[PDB]
Amino acid sequence: APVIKAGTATDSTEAGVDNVANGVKSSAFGYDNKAIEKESSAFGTGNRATGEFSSAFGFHNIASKIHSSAFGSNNAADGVNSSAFGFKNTVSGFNSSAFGSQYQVTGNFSGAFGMGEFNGQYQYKNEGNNSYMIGNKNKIASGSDDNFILGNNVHIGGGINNSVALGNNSTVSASNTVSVGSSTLKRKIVNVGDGAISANSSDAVTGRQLYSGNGIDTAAWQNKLNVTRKNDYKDANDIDVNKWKAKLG
Amino acid sequence: APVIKAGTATDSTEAGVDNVANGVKSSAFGYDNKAIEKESSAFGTGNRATGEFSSAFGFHNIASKIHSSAFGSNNAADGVNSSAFGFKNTVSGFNSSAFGSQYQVTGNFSGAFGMGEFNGQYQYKNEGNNSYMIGNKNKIASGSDDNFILGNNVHIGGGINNSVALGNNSTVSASNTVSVGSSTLKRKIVNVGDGAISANSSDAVTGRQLYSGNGIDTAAWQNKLNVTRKNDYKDANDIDVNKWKAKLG
Amino acid sequence: APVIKAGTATDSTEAGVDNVANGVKSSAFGYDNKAIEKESSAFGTGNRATGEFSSAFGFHNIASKIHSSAFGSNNAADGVNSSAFGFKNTVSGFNSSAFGSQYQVTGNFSGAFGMGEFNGQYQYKNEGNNSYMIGNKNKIASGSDDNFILGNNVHIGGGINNSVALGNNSTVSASNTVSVGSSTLKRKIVNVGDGAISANSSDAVTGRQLYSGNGIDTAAWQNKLNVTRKNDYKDANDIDVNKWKAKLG
Amino acid sequence: QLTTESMPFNVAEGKEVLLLVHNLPQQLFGYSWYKGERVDGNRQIVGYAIGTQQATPGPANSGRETIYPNASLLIQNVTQNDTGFYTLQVIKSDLVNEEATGQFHVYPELPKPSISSNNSNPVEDKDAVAFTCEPETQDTTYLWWINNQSLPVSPRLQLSNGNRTLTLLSVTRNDTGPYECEIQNPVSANRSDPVTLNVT
Amino acid sequence: QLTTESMPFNVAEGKEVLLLVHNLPQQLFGYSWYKGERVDGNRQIVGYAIGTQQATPGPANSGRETIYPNASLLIQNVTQNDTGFYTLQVIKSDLVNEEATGQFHVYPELPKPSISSNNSNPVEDKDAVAFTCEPETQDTTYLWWINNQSLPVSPRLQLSNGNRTLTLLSVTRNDTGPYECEIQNPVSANRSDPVTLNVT
Amino acid sequence: QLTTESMPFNVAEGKEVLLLVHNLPQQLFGYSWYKGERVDGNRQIVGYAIGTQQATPGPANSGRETIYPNASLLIQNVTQNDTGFYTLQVIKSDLVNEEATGQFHVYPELPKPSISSNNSNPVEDKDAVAFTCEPETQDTTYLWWINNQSLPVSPRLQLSNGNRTLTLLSVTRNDTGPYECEIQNPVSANRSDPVTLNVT
Ligand SMILES: *[C@@H]1O[C@H](CO)[C@@H](O)[C@H](O)[C@H]1NC(C)=O
Ligand SMILES: *[C@@H]1O[C@H](CO)[C@@H](O)[C@H](O)[C@H]1NC(C)=O
Ligand SMILES: *[C@@H]1O[C@H](CO)[C@@H](O)[C@H](O)[C@H]1NC(C)=O
Ligand SMILES: *[C@@H]1O[C@H](CO)[C@@H](O)[C@H](O)[C@H]1NC(C)=O
Ligand SMILES: *[C@@H]1O[C@H](CO)[C@@H](O)[C@H](O)[C@H]1NC(C)=O
Ligand SMILES: *[C@@H]1O[C@H](CO)[C@@H](O)[C@H](O)[C@H]1NC(C)=O
Ligand SMILES: *[C@@H]1O[C@H](CO)[C@@H](O)[C@H](O)[C@H]1NC(C)=O
Ligand SMILES: *[C@@H]1O[C@H](CO)[C@@H](O)[C@H](O)[C@H]1NC(C)=O
Ligand SMILES: *[C@@H]1O[C@H](CO)[C@@H](O)[C@H](O)[C@H]1NC(C)=O
Ligand SMILES: *[C@@H]1O[C@H](CO)[C@@H](O)[C@H](O)[C@H]1NC(C)=O
Ligand SMILES: *[C@@H]1O[C@H](CO)[C@@H](O)[C@H](O)[C@H]1NC(C)=O
Ligand SMILES: *[C@@H]1O[C@H](CO)[C@@H](O)[C@H](O)[C@H]1NC(C)=O
Ligand SMILES: *[C@@H]1O[C@H](CO)[C@@H](O)[C@H](O)[C@H]1NC(C)=O
Ligand SMILES: *[C@@H]1O[C@H](CO)[C@@H](O)[C@H](O)[C@H]1NC(C)=O
Ligand SMILES: *[C@@H]1O[C@H](CO)[C@@H](O)[C@H](O)[C@H]1NC(C)=O
Ligand SMILES: *[C@@H]1O[C@H](CO)[C@@H](O)[C@H](O)[C@H]1NC(C)=O
Ligand SMILES: *[C@@H]1O[C@H](CO)[C@@H](O)[C@H](O)[C@H]1NC(C)=O
Ligand SMILES: *[C@@H]1O[C@H](CO)[C@@H](O)[C@H](O)[C@H]1NC(C)=O
């Protein structure tokens, strides 16, 4: 029968059946819960809180570091100030978070929000630092940092930093780029405001801007294309006289 | 008075007042909690855990499937490996997640992070598969899949796949497009790196690139615009001689 | 020794050691937990639930309003229908959420997903309404609303509305803009579909479109550049006669 | 207890009806009005959210329905198709739903009626002439008026087809007067043209 | 109890081997096959996920391995490097792992052998000529066939270097016959050329 | 117990002051220094975060303050406006705040003073001439010096305006000597030019 009793440390509480509480001011409530560190809490079924100030709430959750939260089902938060929320999320980095299902985050100050895959091991993981993924089945290789993904099936290889991937099945192939598609599917960017055609502006021109061409360098373009200006074509400027007289008598 | 006692199944725990635990290795801690399936836990006030390995922690939470987490207030996670975290979040899809307030996710492998609206029914819901919305009051119609939203008041209609919406009050009207604004508000894209003007490059040209025109096809442009190259003008190439002699004597 | 007993209100439960339950149908489970409002739950170690229907689960969590959830470590959800999940997250807004570590959200209907910084005070906070941040160490000043950030080290000043920032170290300097970089680092946009060159289209032209120039206004461009069409140059159209006959004899 | 009251209960076609709400709970989260006795998401007419103070029309909305902060529902341009039950859903602060119901009937603008007789010249000594109001419409009430006075009940005054048809078993020359009939519903009624008897 | 069975246990090089699984638990979450006796992420060959019904190759995959819905693993183009232990990881519905193991041996295609004599013309009255099959291979079994019948065990028939060398201590003219030796491994066996004795 | 100690307690203007921290807890999460006796977010000078090892200035920072890894605060180019209380916030591993206070005084560098007399020619037999050090300054200590030895206490040596005005009640020709005034503060002190009497 369930019982309430003190654990093996001062102010340690065991509530339920087959509970173990070993840390000072720790508590294990439920069935088969273990709270082994100081001020650690394990509430639910089969949870393990093996780090100080760590809490595992739910079903078969594991928290292992100085401030770890594993809330949900089969989450493993093994990282300082790390949080694993959802279903079967493993966070192994420092100050990293993960929300969703079957996602692993081994990078530092990284995050993931979506669904990955776990057959017997995590097939899609976040191994980059300061990188975030929102989508399904996304990969970031180790050594690729400061990368952001908003899409599905986006795999980032090694040595790709400061990159953003947007949309389903997007592809990143270089650093300091924003990708809105792959070599097979290319997306249009619609509803773009007019650019700032000028010498030094870094904007995005639109269809109407290039259609009309307002604000272009009328002098630079007249050198790249050898343009006979109508003013000269009217005033006979810059012609040969020993040559025109030949064909024209 | 609150009591600790066994439930109706082996290793089932009831802690508190008016609790019911019916699953094997289940536990209901708090007030008016029901845990009816194997290894299901309901901790808090008025929670219901009606699925195996499901946990409902908080206030009036409902978990109904084989791995369901409803953490917060009035969350209903009715979906396999589905998580509903926050306030009044309903997840009805497979492996789908939701964090925030008053959001519903009926799609498969979908997610929502933000605030919706619930007067008596969910007014803003994610009904698309493999789709994610981050923002306030966002809608994705059923049959529109692989869509991503980063903005507020973005409604996606039927038959719109592989689309990305960015910013407040953005509008998506077609598939395989990235939308930056609506027909009324059009945003500029600033701080864009120089493109790769060439025969096959798919980049985004900037204001300076269109201003100077470096790297354009100097031969193709000279056919679309019937220019008269200064070399031919200065050397009388490509002229008529039988009728130029007429006007010029 | 731990004890199970009634609180100071009807159907109020205290489980553990040194617990206080004062609200009707409230419960405090663990060590040093206080549940002071009606139907409020405090499960874990040192949690405080001072608002109705509020739940604080974890370690040193505080919930203070009518529907508040503080799940994790040292979270403070002081806001109506607000949720603070993770490590040391403070949500002070209305219907706002925060997931991650050391992030503060004081705006209304706002959110943050990432890591900030907390030395003795929150150094990076979300002070804008209807604004969302995903990344590390991002700032939104008060009065700047409807802003979205996908990146790190992005600080948004005052009076900047309807803006989107993408990528690491991005910079926003105006309203109704989308920024993909700063004045120092500028990102390219790759894999862009072909635009819709026309009179009124608002698209993004690509490198090939500007290279070939197909679909441009062949008549408008021929006025801005004073080209001499071969149809006239070969045909002697539009020339002076009193002046050509002078130099050409 | 939550109760709703139609105002008025019977509405003429094309008019408006207002459903009042009484004993509304103290702490509330929002309201919703559903068409029919059930609360189904497909039948939601309109919904209010006190928190953000927004009134969002539902799938069953037709543009004629407005919700009010004190939970009353106003339906303008009412039609005969609207006759039915309406349920109000009230969500309290703890988000436990409370339910009520209300109904009203829509009736048409009953027009000018007319009368007919199958014998134009009653025989003075005796005849069995019948009187009937032709313009048949549903769920009305019929009553007859003779000599500007309600008909005197007698077996001599036979009624058939319910009592839209008035048959006079045995006429007399002393019965000459204006015959005039009414067709009447809970919302309106106005009179026909007097019909005389021909004797000599 | 989870048991795996190789089929066949011994496979010729370049053939295929199929690992069967028995007593598979009723409620499952997915499978995974690892090379070696350990379960390590670096050794994962292939993995299946029943939920999404997807088979994903692992880092140890070489393109020759396919997993089946009934947890079976098929390896095509088997090579001598594949000989070893394989472990199957079964993840039940509650996500508690269950482990099993299986193994198979790969053997090469042994050719015709050949025989040599260190004395070409045995002396009729007596000689000590030795017979040896030259083409040395590992882990094989040899056996000698004389007058195409199995060699009669006798101290007169000496065997050296295991029994790959057959030495005849004292030959006689009556021993003239076809000498012929075999090599056999668990997977195959086939013959050399008969060798005769020269006497007069 | 957390204690802070200013070093030095009194600082001349434009110099630097270093606040030491003693008995710092073993397990820490970060520090913060606030101006004034209160801990307010608007008064934060600087903060340190041991985890990420970042030192972030606060709203009250002026560019003259640096935080050391051992929680000491260094303030360079100090001004008279900085005189006040400072509080140190220490956040332990469990994130329970611990507070301590410290203070220092800023004083100006006082110059050469100067002396004045109302009577240039004291009368030899007797006079009541008064000496005064004119350059008035706040919170400082005044010291007189006669024939380079400290003034001998006597009712003869009257003092006025506190003791910046020295009145000689009944002068004599034997009182002739150098008269010199000293203006000193907690941080500095230097002297004036000796003054003499005129007698004959
Ligand atoms: C609700 O609002 C309308 C307009 O203010 C009003 O006519 C109606 O009486 C109100 N209901 C009640 C019960 O007062
Ligand atoms: C009322 O209903 C009829 C039928 O739709 C329509 O023609 C009429 O314009 C409506 N009047 C108003 C004020 O809506
Ligand atoms: C009165 O009679 C006229 C003629 O048919 C009809 O149009 C009208 O609806 C009637 N009004 C009422 C109140 O019965
Ligand atoms: C018509 O009036 C005559 C008068 O004699 C009567 O006989 C007859 O019953 C009436 N017919 C009908 C159908 O009421
Ligand atoms: C008699 O005639 C008038 C209309 O002509 C009618 O209004 C009145 O009601 C009738 N008399 C009585 C008592 O009803
Ligand atoms: C006429 O018909 C209705 C049918 O319900 C009846 O109530 C009413 O009394 C009848 N009037 C006479 C005079 O029969
Ligand atoms: C598994 O599938 C393969 C092909 O269908 C089959 O050959 C094998 O017999 C199956 N294993 C079992 C134990 O049935
Ligand atoms: C089998 O393996 C050998 C060596 O890699 C290769 O040459 C051969 O083509 C393979 N055959 C098949 C059917 O895979
Ligand atoms: C037979 O010998 C040949 C070549 O000498 C070899 O390729 C083959 O594997 C052998 N077959 C068997 C069944 O031993
Ligand atoms: C070679 O053959 C002769 C036959 O007499 C025998 O004596 C001898 O042992 C053989 N040598 C070897 C190495 O077998
Ligand atoms: C003897 O003859 C043939 C070889 O030609 C062989 O196949 C057969 O098996 C031999 N007899 C026995 C018992 O092996
Ligand atoms: C030949 O060597 C093997 C070694 O295991 C042995 O098993 C076999 O019995 C031997 N045969 C003879 C005839 O010695
Ligand atoms: C604190 O750090 C600085 C830098 O080394 C040092 O000058 C100071 O003495 C340190 N204080 C103590 C008590 O060690
Ligand atoms: C100190 O402050 C004064 C006035 O602000 C300034 O002139 C001086 O340059 C400063 N000295 C240093 C070393 O910063
Ligand atoms: C000495 O007086 C001078 C100016 O007269 C001043 O600059 C200085 O600060 C003083 N130094 C001390 C130690 O009092
Ligand atoms: C000025 O000096 C004279 C000397 O006789 C003395 O009488 C007088 O008190 C002094 N007055 C002041 C204001 O010091
Ligand atoms: C006497 O003379 C010198 C200055 O001339 C001074 O430094 C010294 O301290 C004086 N002696 C005393 C006891 O003050
Ligand atoms: C000079 O002024 C201060 C004021 O506190 C006093 O302490 C000191 O004793 C005075 N010196 C004499 C000789 O009076």
Author numbering:
A (entry chain B), B (entry chain A), C (entry chain C): 26 to 274
D (entry chain D), E (entry chain E), F (entry chain F): 35 to 234
Source paper text:
The fusobacterial trimeric autotransporter adhesin (TAA) CbpF binds to CEACAM1 on immune cells, resulting in downregulation of their activity against tumors colonized by F. nucleatum. In contrast to Fap2, CbpF is a homotrimeric type Vc autotransporter protein, in which all three protomers together form a trimeric passenger domain that remains exposed on the cell surface after expression, and a C-terminal β-barrel domain that serves as a membrane anchor. The ECD of CEACAM1 comprises an N-terminal, membrane-distal immunoglobulin variable region-like (IgV-like) domain and three membrane-proximal immunoglobulin constant region-like (IgC2-like) domains IgC2-like A1, IgC2-like B, and IgC2-like A2. CbpF binds to CEACAM1 via a protruding loop (D142–Y149) and via H92 on the respective adjacent protomer chain.
We therefore formed the complex of nanodisc-reconstituted CbpF and CEACAM1-ECD (residues 35–428, ACRO Biosystems) and removed excess of CEACAM1 by preparative size exclusion chromatography (SEC). We then vitrified the SEC fraction corresponding to the main peak and resolved the structure of the complex to 2.7 Å, applying C3 symmetry. The structure revealed a heterohexameric complex in which one CEACAM1 is bound per CbpF protomer, with the N-terminal IgV-like domain of CEACAM1 and the region around the β roll protruding loop of CbpF forming the interface. Each CEACAM1 protrudes perpendicularly from the central CbpF trimer and sits atop the β roll protruding loop of CbpF. Four residues of the eight-residue long loop 142–149, i.e., E142, N144, Q146, and Q148, form H-bonds with side chains of T90, Q78 [Q44 in mature chain (11)], and Y68 of CEACAM1. In addition, there are two further H-bonds three β strands “above” in the stack that are formed between H92 and N99 of CbpF and the backbone of S127 and D128 of CEACAM1. Importantly, H92 originates from the neighboring CbpF protomer, and both together form one CEACAM1 interface. Instead, a tight interface is formed exclusively by the peptide moieties predominantly via H-bonds, whereas only two hydrophobic surface-exposed residues (F63 and L129 in CEACAM1) are buried in the complex. The rest of the CEACAM1 side of the interface appears slightly negatively charged, whereas at the CbpF side of the interface, positive charges dominate. Our CbpF/CEACAM1 complex structure shows that CEACAM1-F63 is in close proximity to H92 and F143, which probably form aromatic stacking interactions.
